[PDB]
Amino acid sequence: QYGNTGASIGNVMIGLEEAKDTTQTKAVNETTTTKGDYTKL
Amino acid sequence: DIMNAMLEVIGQLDIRRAQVLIEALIVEMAEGDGINLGVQWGSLESGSVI
């Protein structure tokens, strides 16, 4: 990781993971899906 | 005598005053131009942008 660059790989990968669609499952059989925010990316 | 002197001073300080017509002219000519063009790129699936 480097600070010379515009943006650092850390915030970019974290942002891309936050942007992915997350699913939250509760079995017994509920499964919910939700889209993630892009605000970090 | 002093009377005849001050009347000759007053006579010459009483003259008519000419009057000037001052006409200014202000000219302001501006001009501007610009051309801004460029191509950007992006892929938001794996975030990569130009």
Give your account of this protein's structure.
This is part of a larger assembly, with 2 copies of chain A. By secondary structure, chain A is of the alpha+beta class. Helix content of chain A is 27%, strand content 24%. The first copy, chain A, has 1 helix and 2 strands, in the order αββ. Chain A has one helix at 9-19, and strands at 22-26, 30-34. A two-stranded antiparallel sheet of chain A has the order 1-2. In chain A, a hairpin with a 3-residue loop joins strand 1 and strand 2. The longest helix of chain A is centred in the middle third of the chain and has 11 residues, at 9-19. Chain A is elongated. Chain A binds chain B through residues 12, 15-16, 19, 41, and chain B through 44, 46-47.
SSE topology string of chain A: HEE
Structural class of chain A: alpha+beta
Portion in beta strands of chain A: 15-25%
Tell me the distance between the termini of chain A.
17 Å
Quaternary structure annotation:
part of a larger assembly
Characterize the overall form of chain A: elongated
Rounded radius of gyration of chain A (Å): 15 Å
User: Helical segment tally of chain A?
Assistant: 1
Strand order of the largest sheet of chain A: 1-2
Key features?
part of a larger assembly; alpha+beta; 41 residues; 2 chains; 1 helix; two-stranded antiparallel ribbon; 24% strand; Secretin GspD (chain B); 27% helix
Topology:
The structure is cut from a larger assembly and holds two copies of chain A.
Chain A lengths: L8 H11 L2 E5 L3 E5 L7
Antiparallel strand pairs in A: 1-2
